[PDB]
């Protein structure tokens, strides 16, 4: 049953956005420039990191798409919010890992 | 046919996720809603 999650709901939950559209990812990715620019501790553990799986997994099948202008602009907005998030992550890592 | 499509095609992603945009990719975005 953990395999039923881990096989069926795993790649089912992955291929939710097997086809998914172009503008909506800019909309809710911009809403993850809302929520990803709320910090970590406001947002929370799998909240923050799973939203990183939502832009990670919103940059996801776009390598599978085609080249319009919104393709490149969403590559910029996505990947720069990605590395803002990653920098904030390692900041928080080091922030507690010499809190001693 | 969400049993056939949802259950039988992309639940384990066999076959791949882009063919649903390709083998079912001709002006059927209503059916994708």
From Swiss-Prot, chain A:
Coiled coil: none
Subcellular location: Cytoplasmic vesicle, Secretory vesicle; Bud; Bud neck
Residue ranges crossing the lipid bilayer per the database entry: none
Covalent S-S links between cysteines: none
UniProt miscellaneous comment: Present with 4280 molecules/cell in log phase SD medium.
Function: Involved in the secretory pathway as part of the exocyst complex which tethers secretory vesicles to the sites of exocytosis. Plays a role in the assembly of the exocyst.
Subunit-structure text: The exocyst complex is composed of SEC3, SEC5, SEC6, SEC8, SEC10, SEC15, EXO70 and EXO84. Interacts with RHO3.
UniProt similarity note: Belongs to the EXO70 family.
Protein name: Exocyst complex component EXO70
Gene it is expressed from: EXO70
Parent sequence residues shown: 53 to 156 of 623
From Swiss-Prot, chain B:
Entire protein: shown range: 169 to 201 of 753
Protein family membership: Belongs to the EXO84 family.
Protein's job: Involved in the secretory pathway as part of the exocyst complex which tethers secretory vesicles to the sites of exocytosis. Plays a role in both the assembly of the exocyst and the polarization of this complex to specific sites of the plasma membrane for exocytosis and to the budding site. Also involved in assembly of the spliceosome.
Domain of life, source organism: Eukaryota
Assembly description: Component of the exocyst complex composed of SEC3, SEC5, SEC6, SEC8, SEC10, SEC15, EXO70 and EXO84. Also interacts with SNP1.
Entry's transmembrane regions: none
Compartmental location: Cytoplasmic vesicle, Secretory vesicle; Bud; Bud neck
Listed name of the protein: Exocyst complex component EXO84
